Symmetry: C3
Subunit: 495 residues, 3 copies
């Protein structure tokens, strides 16, 4: 009966006919279709967004996404500890909700539960049922978490969660959210986040990267489609002055982007980017930037060396540093923007080659693992598969040397920003002129942008070692210049 | 001839007859008994306190206690290093003898030698014979250590050792120390520690936890029996408004506590607790608290959330912080008080199930290992034995996740106390009012009590994750409140 | 024809005849000898300094020196990171070029390339060809590095490289450098370093430690021969009031030192020592000390407890600390001076026994490995070979316990110097008297000398645990004394 459907749903016909999934009957994925025909287009069919339906025919992709592994060093790894990825986090992000809890990432299957349970999300409201002993459970959100209710309080939490956060954790609102989270769907940017979490049962769906109608490689993230549309010729995924994306607009309500050829750069960039998904402040007037404003669901697609200019051009910053008052940018996991134009990218390698390598299942069917891999833990498939001359030690050696050298500059930029911050408080206290203190704030802005990008980014330089060195040494230079300007000023007091 | 003995030693008869050790002749453990009969009760028999006599019939318990293992990461692990368990120790304990040396614990067989040789004990007087190459030797104290004499000095040492320390290192003074170390035995609290160390040949004896007369599970520690007697209904080991302990008082001179059923919580709490075993100061008048005072050999049996109130109620603190002058409590290894009322305790699990698991000896006799185990290093017997569904990775994952999350809050509380301490010195220097500085000291008291308990405790949260989170976030809140009060005050100067 | 040569080269005859290499024809190592005879001693023969000629008859020594290994934790390990060997490097060495980059050592075959490429050498001018993916390549310098040219700049670099540096990286200038780098050879101390690097093709040559003419164990380093000649009776390698070295002086131009018996202490001390190879300042007048001055290529051969006195006696220091102005000594890898008079040295063990242990090659020929070994990574040959009762765990345990205890004192001395430095800036700012500030500078001098020696030295105490404890506790004492003097002074302001 698809022809009857197709009379009214012509884009679906275009994706589905003569495709890999051509023969799949509609009722496989959609329930209540008879009521939809009979009663008309008031009675919408039900589209349950759900991995297990793809799993029925794609079991190795489904099993590997859900497989439970246990890293013997644990998870919930706070970054802000002496031996961690961001040892001076509490000082350098003073004034930001990340200081309440920010841990290293873990597996994809945990993404909703970890978003909802982290100390910075919603005041500790949502917790794992049964506590720590069930921290490794996968599946449905509300089988794993419980809701302690709106009036419960837990000490040293924050309330940074909002609806836009969910757009990088699940495909469950694909039909229930208007492009950008503008008003008109069941939920939008201004929704109460605690109404929204109830509807998220599942982590990133299979449909996030694969069209259900015709199995075409795709993107569904609003912010990512929008950024590419803004900059169709020069954006990080472009080639030859265009990008391999066709935007399909459904009813004026929501878009997808279909690509002729798999580009896991774009598919992983639906989440692995710097973004704004939060309220902020305007640099010019200091006016609030609320969820009313499109700037609160936004993807720059710019790297470390471009981002301070970019946020100044859209008159936006995230928080004032608690000590210096500097108008800082908060950075988050810019892996796509870092990877852009690195040695591997310019070689045509994509994220999935190192992070979703080929493994054999079952009997012995070849597939891309959909439990994403930490390359250092799997160098034979993530690296040696292509670098056939490498031994596992060599692969490890190369990953660690680059991170070693990058980390040395990261720790040195932190030492310098801490010096900047300590010098500034001294300079204040001895009331050095607000003019001078303001020159120092620009120094902080610059040194912070060129530093925090790399604690937020998760490769410690491996994704782009040149850009990391350039950025971090820029940060150091910025901070030592601020420290010299302030000390010059502090002397000039009793002068 | 035991009947003749029994005419005069009626408690022994009560422990020994119809027991597991009924048939053991007295002369097995006691020498000079004929002179005792013949010459009378002036000539006391000799009771050599000594593991090797139990070993003669209990070889697997004896061999496993003495077995030498070599951890390839070494021992003598100072806590106060950037990657260690207490990275800000030197700043936060400024003014306390722990700043001279405080290392992580190692095996039981080393306990006397490590107490005597640590840099904080007695000015470096006692050293390992032959130096580092014999650091792993077990056995008799004075076969392993040498006495460089009373006038030798070693730089950057302290002289914190006293007799009461020995009561958690050996059973060797069981007959030679009057309850609490009151005057009347060969040694008491006011003895010169260098007279006492000469009499300690052996680490914790087999008799510390097992009655020699009838093999009944027991405690011998004075401080522990006393605390339970103070609080027989509500103490951490109680149940149903009483505790499973019968106190046996010998001649008015020394007590034991026998339990009808093995409770390794109590048996390990003879040492693994917070204690006072040191001189201190009175909070009200600032008067010294010397060894004359019973407060110097004392067990609170209270957890992190109760201890500041408890030490205020007995008008006692350990040291003024070198910078802030805050009247701090010094905390030590409160493992029993932490474990109380945690998930495993409420499940009826005891310390020995994870730390003394079942192993097979010899031929293949089943026994509890008496070389106490670090569970993460032995998850198959310490964890999987009960959690039969766990893989070794899962067990490790659970231990490390909890420690990971706990440690993130510990490091964040340290960042905050360091901020408190740095802010205070600023506030002083700019002479903010001693009234305000005093409000800040209370903040320090509170934030320190809720922080240092967890560096002293050895599980990094695993023993009680809820109480750890509650305490540490309390510390943070306390410190950020102090820092806000002081900064408010520091501005109010040039105001 | 050697007799004809010998008529004019009589020292060579003395080394070569009746030796292990007696039969080797001259033309094996020297080309153009006929032109030298025919045209005379204007046409010098060519002596290509080159491992591969020794390799032709000594293949196992050559292969093991060049073998490529890949440490899976990587290389380029910056010291100045929280978990590294010198976590407070940026603060404590403020004002020195080491703050731009100082990493842990790696294999011998990398020594030239790492000297030329490090961020502190020559402004980033020299880089690995092909970047990170060729960081593990060995062989010829200029097959591995490229020269970006004199006008290229890279941010956050330094320009500390000079010709004297090369003397601890290669044997390539053995015939082209006059003793001490005095003027007269192709290169000397005042040469432009960028003229010199072009002539260094190879790392340390086989000839650095082995005479080519007669295979005698030897030294070629100018600074080392000179120090031993200064102090022939009492120097660290002496015995019975002399040293086992015969100095051979060729034409007044360059010296070797031949030893009757292998002493790898001396042979490794050609580089593994504290040295001055840099310009400096005079303590008395503050006058520059330039390459004109012999003090710029100099070996003290003194340990941690002697070096401050030694540098004061030759009126030399390296840099003023950027904050305190203290006239500091910069220390570098004093492994020979530390090892002197330690337990292993007094037992007659030499560096090569632990670092070049016996291995079997090829078929199964026994040899000393010439890829120098990190003992902890090879305890069976580096330790158990002599300590036959040791298990690999025990060996590891002993190395790590000593480093553990040593590191605890190192981190505590760093905490104290940082306190000194922070206190001093406070004391300045509140202008405490330059007299008092000067007493503090002496405190800094002393605490720095007794601290930085051990971050520079590479064993973390294992080479000499007693001297390490003595030095580091001396540093702590020095710093806490400075901190007390300054605080006493800072109070005495508003007094
Ligand atoms: C699972 C394998 C599917 C099969 C087979 C079919 N559809 Fe589908 N459809 C499915 C998903 C998961 C979604 C949600 C949105 C997304 O792009 O992933 C949908 C959505 C539709 C819609 C809504 C389009 C819009 O206007 O915004 C229509 C109208 C739809 N699906 C129709 C449709 C028809 C007519 C089918 C048989 C020919 C059919 N679908 C098969 C998943 C699946
Ligand atoms: C948004 C819906 C996402 C998309 C699309 C991709 N990733 Fe992701 N990733 C995301 C989250 C929120 C997390 C953290 C989950 C948590 O609960 O902590 C991650 C985690 C990873 C990791 C770490 C994996 C692990 O430790 O086990 C990697 C390596 C990873 N992500 C890479 C990755 C790649 C290559 C993608 C395209 C194929 C990709 N991610 C998609 C969010 C989302
Ligand atoms: C091989 C040439 C890679 C490509 C292409 C991409 N990544 Fe990567 N990633 C790489 C390494 C060696 C590391 C360091 C940590 C490791 O595990 O080895 C990383 C790190 C990540 C992380 C951190 C999680 C983890 O895997 O440890 C993420 C979240 C990640 N990378 C994502 C990512 C994305 C989105 C990519 C394309 C834009 C990308 N990676 C490319 C190796 C390689
Ligand atoms: C093929 C699909 C690749 C996979 C998977 C990985 N690498 Fe790679 N690498 C590849 C190419 C074509 C290049 C370009 C230069 C060249 O040899 O042609 C590289 C580059 C590197 C480098 C240098 C990187 C830099 O920033 O300059 C290293 C150190 C490297 N590659 C190692 C590496 C490792 C460890 C991988 C697993 C994470 C890995 N690569 C994946 C081809 C491919
Ligand atoms: C070792 C297995 C023992 C055997 C058999 C017996 N005794 Fe014992 N006794 C032993 C120890 C290790 C100690 C010290 C204190 C402790 O409680 O562990 C003792 C102590 C006694 C005492 C002193 C009691 C007091 O008044 O404070 C008496 C009087 C004593 N032991 C008597 C005794 C008699 C009469 C025995 C044979 C029937 C006998 N003991 C057996 C260890 C051992
Ligand atoms: C006082 C006499 C003690 C009793 C009773 C118990 N323990 Fe203990 N323990 C004590 C000391 C002084 C030390 C440190 C020894 C040193 O020289 O450093 C310890 C050490 C442990 C450890 C660490 C073991 C190791 O690293 O190898 C654990 C796990 C341990 N202690 C647990 C433990 C348990 C469960 C007890 C009751 C069965 C117990 N201890 C008794 C002091 C004393
Ligand atoms: C299993 C449910 C446990 C019980 C009951 C007890 N402990 Fe524990 N302990 C546990 C873990 C997982 C850890 C973390 C470190 C590890 O090695 O895995 C600990 C830690 C200790 C330590 C530190 C020494 C060490 O084992 O690493 C001590 C000294 C210790 N625990 C003592 C102790 C006491 C006295 C207990 C009953 C009050 C107690 N533990 C219970 C696991 C478990
Ligand atoms: C390699 C195995 C060699 C053989 C065989 C011979 N010589 Fe050599 N010689 C060689 C080296 C590597 C060097 C450089 C300096 C050093 O001491 O390593 C030399 C140096 C000479 C010199 C210069 C001495 C000086 O006056 O400063 C002479 C004159 C020399 N070598 C002569 C010589 C003669 C006459 C030989 C055959 C009998 C001969 N050499 C063999 C390496 C080798
Ligand atoms: C000057 C010509 C040297 C002589 C002679 C010796 N060593 Fe050395 N060593 C030197 C350098 C410059 C380096 C660093 C190389 C780099 O590129 O980083 C080293 C390194 C070592 C190491 C570390 C080895 C490694 O990590 O793989 C050791 C253990 C070592 N050196 C010891 C050593 C010994 C025992 C020597 C005499 C036999 C010796 N070195 C000679 C410089 C020179
Ligand atoms: C065995 C008794 C040794 C002797 C003799 C020498 N060294 Fe050593 N060295 C030793 C150990 C156990 C360590 C600690 C690090 C390890 O790898 O085990 C060291 C360290 C070094 C280093 C650092 C590089 C490294 O090997 O990790 C160097 C550069 C080094 N030692 C040099 C050196 C020299 C020059 C010696 C004679 C003066 C010397 N070592 C003696 C063990 C032993
Ligand atoms: C003609 C008139 C038809 C026919 C024959 C079918 N559908 Fe639809 N359908 C139609 C309209 C106008 C609407 C939506 C109006 C609106 O809310 O904007 C729809 C909606 C759907 C949806 C859901 C979109 C959402 O969840 O927001 C699905 C999944 C869907 N239709 C499927 C479908 C199938 C399988 C049909 C043949 C059985 C079919 N439709 C017939 C209009 C018409
Ligand atoms: C009756 C009178 C007896 C008899 C028949 C025995 N003992 Fe004792 N014993 C007795 C007294 C009054 C004392 C101690 C007086 C004092 O110092 O307080 C003791 C002491 C012991 C002790 C030592 C206690 C200590 O070390 O402080 C031991 C181990 C002991 N007695 C054992 C013992 C045995 C085995 C006897 C039968 C052979 C025996 N005693 C007989 C009084 C009397
Ligand atoms: C007599 C006259 C002879 C004879 C028969 C030989 N050589 Fe030499 N050689 C001689 C002199 C005076 C000089 C150097 C003068 C100077 O520059 O100081 C040399 C030099 C060498 C060198 C090089 C030293 C350097 O590189 O600076 C070598 C390697 C050398 N000679 C080797 C050599 C051999 C193998 C001879 C026999 C074939 C030989 N020489 C003959 C003087 C005389
Ligand atoms: Ca952002
Ligand atoms: Ca205490
Ligand atoms: Ca030096």
């Amino acid at each position: 009966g698809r022809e009857t459907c197709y009379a009214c749903h012509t884009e679906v016909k275009s994706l589905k006919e003569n495709s890999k999934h051509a023969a799949i009957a509609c009722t496989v994925c959609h329930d209540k279709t008879k009521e939809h025909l009979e009663k008309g287009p008031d009675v919408k069919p039900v589209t349950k967004i759900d991995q297990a339906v793809c799993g029925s025919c794609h079991k190795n992709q489904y099993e590997s996404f859900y497989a439970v592994h246990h890293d013997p060093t644990g998870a919930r790894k706070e970054k802000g500890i002496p031996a961690g990825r961001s040892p001076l986090q509490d000082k350098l992000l003073a004034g930001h909700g990340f200081t309440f809890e920010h841990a290293e990432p873990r597996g994809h299957a945990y993404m909703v539960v970890d978003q909802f349970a982290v100390d910075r999300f919603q005041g500790g409201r949502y917790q794992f049922k049964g506590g720590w002993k069930n921290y490794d459970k996968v599946g449905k959100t509300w089988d794993i978490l419980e809701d302690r209710g709106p009036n419960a309080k837990l000490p040293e939490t924050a309330m940074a969660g909002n609806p836009t956060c969910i757009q990088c954790k699940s495909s469950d609102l694909i039909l229930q959210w208007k492009h950008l989270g503008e008003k008109g769907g069941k939920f939008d940017r201004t929704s109460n986040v605690n109404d929204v979490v109830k509807a998220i049962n599942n982590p990133v769906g299979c449909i996030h990267c694969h069209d259900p109608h015709g199995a075409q490689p795709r993107i569904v993230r609003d912010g990512l489609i929008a950024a590419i549309e803004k900059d169709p010729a020069k954006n990080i995924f472009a080639k030859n002055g265009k990008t391999d994306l066709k935007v399909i607009d459904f009813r004026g309500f929501r878009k997808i982007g279909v690509m002729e050829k798999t580009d896991s750069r774009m598919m992983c960039a639906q989440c692995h980017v710097e973004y704004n998904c939060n309220p902020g402040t305007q640099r010019t007037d200091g006016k609030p930037v609320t969820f009313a404003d499109a700037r609160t669901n936004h993807f720059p697609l710019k790297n470390s060396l471009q981002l301070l200019e970019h946020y100044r051009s859209i008159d936006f910053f995230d928080f004032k540093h608690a000590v210096t008052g500097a108008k800082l940018i908060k950075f988050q996991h810019p892996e796509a923007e870092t990877y852009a134009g690195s040695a591997h990218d310019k070689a045509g390698v994509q994220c999935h080659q190192c992070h979703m390598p080929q493994v054999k299942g079952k009997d012995g069917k070849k597939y891309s693992t959909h439990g994403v891999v930490k390359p250092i833990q799997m160098v034979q498939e993530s690296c040696i598969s292509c670098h056939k001359d490498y031994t596992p030690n060599k692969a490890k050696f190369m990953i660690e040397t680059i991170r070693n050298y990058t980390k040395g500059k990261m720790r040195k930029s932190e030492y310098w920003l801490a010096q900047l911050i300590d010098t500034f408080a001294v300079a204040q206290r001895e009331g050095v002129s607000p003019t001078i203190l303001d020159q120092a704030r620009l120094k902080h802005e610059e040194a912070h942008a060129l530093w925090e990008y790399w604690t937020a980014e998760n490769s410690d330089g491996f994704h782009n070692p040149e850009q990391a060195r350039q950025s971090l040494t820029g940060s150091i230079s910025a901070s030592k210049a601020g420290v010299k300007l302030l000390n010059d000023a502090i002397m000039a007091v009793k002068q």
